[PDB]
Paper text:
The axial structure consists of three morphologically distinct regions, the rod, the hook, and the filament from the proximal to the distal end, with a few minor components. The function of the hook is a universal joint that transmits motor torque to the filament in any orientation relative to the motor axis. The rod is a drive shaft that penetrates the peptidoglycan (PG) layer and the outer membrane and connects the hook with the rotor of the motor. The distal rod and hook show distinct mechanical properties, although they share the same helical symmetry and repeat distance and are composed of similar subunit proteins (FlgG and FlgE) with 39% sequence identity.
The previous cryoEM map of the St-hook also showed an unassigned elongated density between the D1 domain and the D0 helices. The shape and position of the density is very similar to the density corresponding to the l-stretch of the Cj-hook or that of the St-rod. The amino acid sequence alignment indicates that the l-stretch of St-FlgE is 18 residues shorter than that of Cj-FlgE. Consistent with this, the density of St-FlgE corresponding to the l-stretch is shorter than the other two and terminates at the position expected from the sequence. The subunit interaction mediated by the l-stretch is not as extensive as in the distal rod. In contrast, the l-stretch of FlgE is shorter than that of FlgG and only interacts with the inner surface of the −5 and −10 subunits. These interactions probably reinforce the hook structure while allowing the axial compression and extension of each hook protofilament for the bending flexibility of the hook.
Residue numbers in the entry:
A (entry chain f): 152 to 302
B (entry chain F): 303 to 402
C (entry chain F), H (entry chain K): 101 to 151
D (entry chain A): 1 to 100
E (entry chain F): 1 to 50
F (entry chain A), J (entry chain G): 353 to 402
G (entry chain K): 252 to 302
I (entry chain a): 51 to 100
């Protein structure tokens, strides 16, 4: 999940076409560190380009794998209403790359409750993934419920 | 730079937690977070919860003198009350021995 | 500024933050926090493109 | 308790010795400032037991320079150090330029 | 009785250790204040012990 | 850079902050002394407990 | 690409000076833009007031 | 103010009270006592209606 | 009514800065491996060695 | 290394830690004294047992 607050007063990026090294080709770039069954940290650059009013082409780019080409296709397109409520384009399954003989992992990605600011600055609210890497028993505690909690 | 150039070499990030009291000391003034502390509320200085820092200035302790010595007196007197209390307790138990 | 190009304290711990990449490098908002370095390396010999 | 007391006592004594030694080389030539640092201790469970000294912290700000009668006493204005050698060939450094 | 006595005694001793450790890092750089809190005990029937 | 030709650099000692630290660390030492005085009086009462 | 918003506009208690200079007394609108929780305080009534 | 948006003590118990609902929310007199929250959520983007 | 036996507790203690550098106490969980003349393995957190 | 030509090295005695040990070992001696006092009172009761 990736929640992000975005300014509505931003203009369309004038640098054409899109490039991953062209910051003026988009308005905001995200980044989420996910992990695969080999535990490689794939850092997805999540680019957001304002196509028009309330509509944003959302690109994904596995920056941790250097063999990936420049993505010119839309992973999704966040489309919204007049009030700025989350309407469409906020869920896509994204396939990662293969690093050191890993497997290309495909994950569900939700942009749930990502709000459109009427004014301000494009700011990512929060990022979360259920993928991690072990990880071992360091210590242990018990709360006031009798539950032995592992650290 | 010698050729009249200026290039940024980095910018230090900042963070806040859900509970400031949930920190853990790691020797000196070094804080490892806990589960009760909160997630890393990241951000930059001068924006939102963060402000402009003390450029070329170091913040000393927030220690006041008067209330510390007041607590030093008051808890000492409470300790004296506990000591006289246990003195009376031990004299009572001395009489309980002297009961037989 | 230690021998390993980083601003370290008396305990030797390096302070981290946002890095700058490119030519010329600018502080990007979507990076991992990195230990801020003060490199004494030579600058990029850039020719004139737009004047 | 008494550990923190003797830690603060010896820290104050050593800091005052540092300050008195800095006073003892007032107005000597080639002097750079040196102070003392502080340290704390790791939490037992979440307590913290002791406050210590991280060590000597030398400061290398620019000082006061007096014009002298000789020409063979040359102080160092910018960042730089004079390379000296002993009888055993070991390399040392000093900003003092008084040589005959 | 003696349980409340040793509870108050160790509480006063630990609070004075906290105060003395706060005195021990007077005028150090980067210090934030820390104190100690209090607690009581549950009533047996309606008594309260500690 | 260009050095001090025929000139010698004395100490970088300021007077005011040195005497300020001399006062402040002395007062911290007095706080430690009164603290250990209270500690020793507490242990005197602990002797006088028996 | 916004929407053309229509609002009620009142010139209530706008007075005509017998002499002087044409001066706007006050302006007020109930429209704003967010806006986030900076801090919080409580007055002497128990009301947690958001800043 | 804990991680669950509530003002909790050292025992973690949340203090309750009258909530405020609406846009803009005001303290109503006929509500259930609710644990008072300090949300960091974004404000309501309200346009100008009466000026 | 009897005694179940000796119960050792291993909470963290008080540490003093020393003059030497060859006296190194153990801060976290860990034990120093010592050997006798007969090669048997023993353990001690004391780090005073010459 | 090169010695102190025309200079004599006095004691390495610090004052503060010496008086600290003088206080602390005195209090430990007081603990031993009160301990043996309690021991002798126990043996007095053992005499008074008969």
């Amino acid at each position: 999940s990736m929640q992000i607050n975005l300014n509505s007063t931003d203009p369309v990026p004038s640098k054409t076409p899109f490039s991953v090294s062209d910051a003026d080709s988009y308005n905001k770039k995200g980044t989420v560190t996910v992990y695969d069954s080999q535990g490689n940290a794939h850092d997805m650059n999540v680019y957001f380009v304002k196509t028009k009013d309330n509509e944003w082409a959302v690109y994904t780019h596995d920056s941790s794998d250097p063999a990936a080409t420049a993505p010119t296709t839309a992973s999704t397109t966040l489309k919204f209403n007049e009030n700025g409520i989350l309407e469409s384009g906020g869920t896509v399954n994204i396939t990662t790359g293969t690093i050191n003989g890993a497997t290309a992992a495909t994950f569900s990605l939700s942009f749930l409750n990502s709000m459109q600011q009427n004014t301000g600055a494009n700011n990512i609210v929060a990022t979360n993934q259920n993928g991690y890497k072990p990880g071992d028993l360091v210590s242990y505690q018990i709360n006031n419920d009798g539950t032995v909690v592992g650290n | 730079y010698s050729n009249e150039q200026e290039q940024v070499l980095g910018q230090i990030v900042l963070a806040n937690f859900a509970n400031n009291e949930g920190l853990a000391s790691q020797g000196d003034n070094v804080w490892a977070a806990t589960q009760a502390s909160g997630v890393a509320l990241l951000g930059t200085a001068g924006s939102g919860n963060f402000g402009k820092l003390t450029n070329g200035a170091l913040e000393a302790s927030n220690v006041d003198l008067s209330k510390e010595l007041v607590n030093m007196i008051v808890a000492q007197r409470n300790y004296q009350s506990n000591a006289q209390t246990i003195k009376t307790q031990d004299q009572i138990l001395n009489t309980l021995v002297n009961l037989r | 500024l230690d021998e390993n190009r980083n601003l370290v304290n008396m305990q030797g711990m390096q302070l981290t933050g946002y890095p700058a990449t490119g030519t010329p490098p600018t502080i990007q908002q979507g990076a991992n926090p990195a230990p801020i370095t003060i490199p004494n390396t030579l600058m990029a010999a850039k020719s004139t493109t737009t004047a | 308790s008494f550990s923190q007391a003797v830690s603060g006592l010896n820290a104050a004594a050593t800091n005052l010795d540092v300050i008195g030694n800095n006073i003892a080389n007032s107005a000597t030539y080639g002097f750079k400032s040196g102070t003392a640092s502080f340290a704390d201790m790791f939490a037992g469970s979440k307590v913290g037991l002791g406050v210590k000294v991280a060590g000597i912290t030398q400061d290398f700000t620019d000082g006061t320079t007096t014009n002298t009668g000789r020409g063979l006493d040359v102080a160092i204005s910018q960042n730089g150090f004079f390379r000296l050698v002993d009888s055993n060939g070991s390399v040392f450094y000093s900003r003092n330029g008084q040589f005959k």
